[PDB]
Paper text:
Here, we identified the first cytoplasmic membrane-bound phospholipase A1 (PlaF) from Pseudomonas aeruginosa, which might be involved in the Lands cycle. PlaF is an important virulence factor, as the P. aeruginosa ΔplaF mutant showed strongly attenuated virulence in Galleria mellonella and macrophages. PlaF, purified with n-octyl-β-D-glucoside (OG) showed PLA1 but no PLA2 activity toward the artificial substrates specific to each of these two phospholipase families and the natural phospholipid diacyl phosphatidylglycerol containing pentanoic and oleic acid at the sn-1 and sn-2 positions, respectively.
To gain insights into the PlaF structure, we crystallized the OG-solubilized PlaF protein purified from P. aeruginosa membranes. The structure was refined at a resolution of up to 2.0 Å. The final model in the asymmetric unit consists of two protein molecules (PlaFA and PlaFB), which are related by improper twofold non-crystallographic symmetry. Active site cavities of both the monomers reveal non-covalently bound ligands—myristic acid (MYR), OG, and isopropyl alcohol (IPA) in PlaFA; and undecyclic acid (11A), OG, and IPA in PlaFB. These FAs are the natural ligands from the homologous organism P. aeruginosa that were co-purified with PlaF, as confirmed by gas chromatography-mass spectrometric (GC-MS) analysis of organic solvent extracts of purified PlaF. The N-terminal 38 amino acids form a long, kinked helix that comprises the putative TM (αTM1) and the JM (αJM1) helices, connecting the catalytic domain with the membrane. The TM-JM helices adopt a coiled-coil-like conformation, where the αTM1 crosses its counterpart at V14 to form an elongated X-shaped dimer interface with the buried surface area of 656 Å2 per monomer. The active site of PlaF comprises the typical serine-hydrolase catalytic triad with S137, D258, and H286 interacting through H-bonds. Finally, the H-bond interaction of catalytic S137 with the carboxyl group of MYR completes an intricate ligand-mediated interaction network bridging the catalytic (S137) and dimerization (V33) sites in PlaF.
Residue numbers in the entry: 1 to 310
The structure:
């Protein structure tokens, strides 16, 4: 019957629009708003034949800040943090290979050592020779290695709840791992809210339709993310022997109630760094630059002012 088929067309039309098209445009609209408010726009560049997506803003005449997201995250983690920075800095935030909109070759290495070399190659690819680095979690682990390996390029380093040391207190993540639980890998749609609860003390407001799509995207990425996470475990590079090689002023910034990586990490790193600064934000979780962006950016600007002003 023509009507049964016609009705079949509309039913699929509405379903395809509801299930696929509306969520995607929703994400594109929110990205448009948050990137636009931060003065950031998206580009891509091929680095060792991998497509690396990145955001860029501010004047190229100003010093470059290169921002590196953590495990399972992407460059949009940095939008609200970057907003007060693009007035005075050339801000760049990339998607690491394996994440976001960048290439994800199935057979590549995604250890932080290999990733740190890709980031250095990326900086050269966009014509940046001297820069400030900031990295969160896995991205901080990577940023620290970049700074240790290429001291001539790095003007300052900000480690925002970075991975890479073994502190006195075992974090809730590392506790979870002993029982085969990893909140950072979202297997089921309900585990996405669990991930947010795990990394935020006070979670920023998130519209329900946007949240569900983010959760769907996280589930779709979970198998590959789990494989990368296994490489981060098996190909782990301790920072303790590397930190003394860093010449740059280094900011250690933590959320005091970080459940993923413990604040006692700072006591490991501080004695090992030539020029450490410290900020511990109160009642804050693992991603201060997302949870309290303007506050975190203000601490970072203060740090940068000191680095420049003397
Ligand atoms: C919880 C993890 C971080 C969430 C980031 C929220 C991104 C979208 O957040 C929404 O954006 C709107 C316009 O930009 C705001 O006006 C809304 O209040 C906010 O819910
Ligand atoms: C512009 C809309 C993008 C929405 C961003 C949602 C925030 C993602 C939460 C992940 C936080 C980082 C987790 C980690 O570093 O381990």
């Amino acid at each position: 019957m023509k009507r049964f088929l016609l009705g079949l067309v509309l039913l699929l039309a509405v379903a395809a629009g509801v299930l696929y098209f509306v969520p995607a445009t929703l994400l594109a609209s929110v990205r448009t708003v948050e990137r636009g408010l931060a003065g950031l726009s998206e580009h891509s560049v091929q680095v060792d034949n991998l497509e690396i997506a990145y955001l860029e803003g501010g004047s190229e005449k100003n010093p470059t800040l290169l921002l590196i997201h953590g495990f399972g995250a992407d460059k949009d983690n940095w939008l609200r943090f970057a907003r007060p920075l693009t007035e005075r800095y050339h801000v760049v935030a990339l998607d690491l290979p394996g994440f976001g909109d960048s290439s994800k070759p199935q057979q590549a290495s995604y250890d932080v050592g290999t990733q740190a070399e890709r980031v250095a190659n990326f900086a050269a690819a966009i014509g940046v020779r001297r820069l400030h680095l900031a990295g969160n979690s896995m991205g901080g682990h990577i940023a620290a290695l970049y700074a240790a390996r290429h001291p001539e390029q790095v003007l300052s380093l900000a480690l925002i709840d970075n991975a890479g040391v073994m502190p006195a207190r075992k974090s809730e993540l590392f506790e979870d791992l002993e029982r085969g639980e990893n909140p950072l890998v979202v297997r089921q749609p309900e585990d996405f809210q669990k991930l947010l609860d795990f990394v935020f003390v006070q979670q920023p407001p998130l519209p329900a339709p946007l949240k569900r799509y983010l959760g769907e995207r996280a589930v779709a990425a979970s198998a590959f993310n789990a494989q990368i996470f296994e490489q981060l475990r098996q190909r782990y590079i301790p920072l303790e022997p590397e930190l003394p090689k860093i010449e740059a002023p280094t900011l250690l910034l933590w959320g005091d109630r970080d459940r993923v990586l413990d604040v006692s990490s700072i006591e490991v790193m501080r004695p090992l760094l030539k020029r450490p600064s410290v900020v511990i934000m109160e009642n804050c979780g693992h991603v201060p630059m997302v949870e309290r962006p303007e506050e975190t950016a203000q601490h970072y600007q203060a740090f940068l002012d000191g680095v420049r002003n003397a």
